[PDB]
Amino acid sequence: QKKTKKNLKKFLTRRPTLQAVREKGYIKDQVFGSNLANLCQRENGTVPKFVKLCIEHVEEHGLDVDGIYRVSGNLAVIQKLRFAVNHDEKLDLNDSKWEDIHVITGALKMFFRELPEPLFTFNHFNDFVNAIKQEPRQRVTAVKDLIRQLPKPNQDTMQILFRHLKRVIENGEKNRMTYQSIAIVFGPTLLKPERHTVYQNQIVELILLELSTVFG
Amino acid sequence: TTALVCDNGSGLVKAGFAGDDAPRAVFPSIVGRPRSYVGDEAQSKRGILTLKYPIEHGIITNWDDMEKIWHHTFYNELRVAPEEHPTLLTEAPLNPKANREKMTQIMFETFNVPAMYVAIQAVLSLYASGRTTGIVLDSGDGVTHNVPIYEGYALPHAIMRLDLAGRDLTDYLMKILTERGYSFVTTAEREIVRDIKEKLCYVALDFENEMATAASSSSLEKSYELPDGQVITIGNERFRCPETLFQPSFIGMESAGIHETTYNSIMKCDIDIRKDLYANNVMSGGTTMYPGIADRMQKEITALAPSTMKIKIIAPPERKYSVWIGGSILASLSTFQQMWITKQEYDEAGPSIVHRKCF
Ligand SMILES: Nc1ncnc2c1ncn2[C@@H]1O[C@H](COP(=O)(O)OP(=O)(O)OP(=O)(O)O)[C@@H](O)[C@H]1O
Ligand SMILES: C/C1=C/C(=O)O[C@@H]2C[C@@H](CC[C@H](C)/C=C\CC1)O[C@@](O)([C@@H]1CSC(=O)N1)C2
Ligand SMILES: [Mg+2]
Helix, strand or coil: CHHHHHHHHHHHHHCCCHHHHHHCCCCCCCCCCCCHHHHHHHCCCCCCHHHHHHHHHHHHHCCCCCCCCCCCCCHHHHHHHHHHHHCCCCCCCCCHHHCCHHHHHHHHHHHHHCCCCCCCCCCCHHHHHHHHHCCHHHHHHHHHHHHHCCCHHHHHHHHHHHHHHHHHHHCHHHHCCCHHHHHHHHHHHHCCCCCCHHHHHHHHHHHHHCHHHHCC | CCCEEEEECCCEEEEEECCCCCCCEEEECCEEEECCEEHHHHHHCCCCEEEECCEECCEECCHHHHHHHHHHHHHHHCCCCHHHCCEEEEECCCCCHHHHHHHHHHHHHHCCCCEEEEEEHHHHHHHHCCCCCEEEEEECCCCEEEEEEECCEECHHHCEEECCCHHHHHHHHHHHHHHHCCCCCCHHHHHHHHHHHHHHCCCCCCHHHHHHHHCCCCCCCEEEECCCCCEEEECCHHHHCHHHHCCHHHHCCCCCCHHHHHHHHHHCCCCCCHHHHHCCEEEECHHHCCCCHHHHHHHHHHHHCCCCCCCCEECCCCHHHHHHHHHHHHHHCHHHHHHCEEHHHHHHHCHHHHHHHCC
16 A cells, blocks of 8 residues: 555646547547537538437427426436447437436537537637627527638537527427527527626527528 | 545445545445435334435435435434545546535535545555555446556556446345245345355356366365254355356346456556556455455466566455545545645535546
8 A cells, every 4th residue: 555655646746637648549539529520520520420310319209298308317327328339339319228218418518518518619709799789680690690700510500509499499389498498408508608697598599580591 | 623534335335534444334325215314324214215226336326315324324323524525536447527516515515525535446445455556356246347557647548347236246146046945036135145245155266167076075065054043055056156257147237247347457557567456466355355356356367468478467455445444544645635625615606516526
């Protein structure tokens, strides 16, 4: 025990940094927690494959479920989903291992939460908050033009995600979800400052509200 | 002055003081609310309460009950004031970011600790075995992980996770004991089977050969007396139950056994360090305590690895508390002093400071 404490004592001060170990290629990014542009490149796409899987599964089995994207799924099952996705294993989101629809929506909300940079990017956060503070007659134009300045992975993933959430609200009579409850869910996760929450929820509401003109 | 070390598992909480050779408190990780008590006091009143496991498969899934676990750990088990002790906690590999933030927020806002830190369970086991590079088989009550580590860094793309663990082995032993007319079903009956599993089960070196010897053997069958005085006997179920770890299809799983997930994890790492991983297989967790599991692993991995590779399984006798012992060593080092997340830092940054400081 004395020899191990001494070596640990010195190892702590001489341990290599995280970036040095990544320079060697020993630490590799997965699906969760990895840069969005790097993930889409490795998959030869502009939308993460797991994002497309969740949306297609929810639009086929969970569009009528009350309080979807608001009700939380089991965190342990989601963690099992993270490993199954991160290893590119044979995966069918309709299998009984994944329990219910809220595990799928919870894993989708987590994917955007775990992103190193927000979907709306760090360097455009100030512009988005300033665009939503403008006079209402000029907001939609300012939001659209900032979106057209984002990189292609962020543009494409934003459209597929928002068009999906639009159909969720359009079935609000069955699932009791509205523009406000959905924006409360995705507001803080899609827009973060590097370093307010009321303006972030307002940005997602506006995009969902004027979906047609914003992505024209 | 002296720091606290707390290893919150899916079944057991191990907590104590940094610098000690063993945890001072080991109590079950259950919370009971009436139809609130925690730990052993909740099991005594299992009829008045509805018991819940706040940790599921190594992941916190009930933050209300988890906050009660820590309150009990501080004031009832260790009998200390949290505002006076730095607190080192443990977590599962690739723990969701929101969970790491909620743990940091609770420790500082609810318990007012002067400093805190969270380390990866498998990393603390590797440290306890005097190593900073190797692959760890961490198998507890709720989850099993194969975590290859380089210089204290868990390699995330190569971490293997299996839902099969100790509790699932107890459930399987309950099932195969119906072949002897025993009917263990309820929660109280499950604790009897887990005790039999801990006392009499072992891993066979050759499972098919061990099956041919079972009838001819004179020493396989053992006796166990239940609380009410009745005596039961167990035969080849002593090693058919832990055989699930190597052949998970015994419980209907499609996953590979822990010997293959170890090999699959090593092969996902860079070829420059596979030799160092093959030679530093460290085992930790209660589910790795079966007699013979080290020799069986040594045999199964050699059959998978190239014939030229040197393979060594490290199964210390204290590996049931390896995670806590490593945390006790780490939090007591002087060179660890500047790594804590101080209270003054948290009040400025908030919970999200955990991602930069704890790695
Ligand atoms: N001698 C033994 N042989 C076999 N199994 C054992 C032995 N002792 C304890 N166990 C099993 O180990 C489990 C407890 O181990 P441990 O406390 O390390 O798990 P944990 O850390 O709470 O779980 P996790 O790491 O999954 O969160 C119990 O399920 C118990 O049945
Ligand atoms: C003695 C003991 C051992 C243990 O580790 O037990 C831990 C904690 C326990 C929680 C409920 C139990 C009724 C209360 C105390 C048991 C604690 O659940 C376990 O027994 C689970 C249930 S069956 C099993 O094998 N593991 C693991
Ligand atoms: Mg553990």
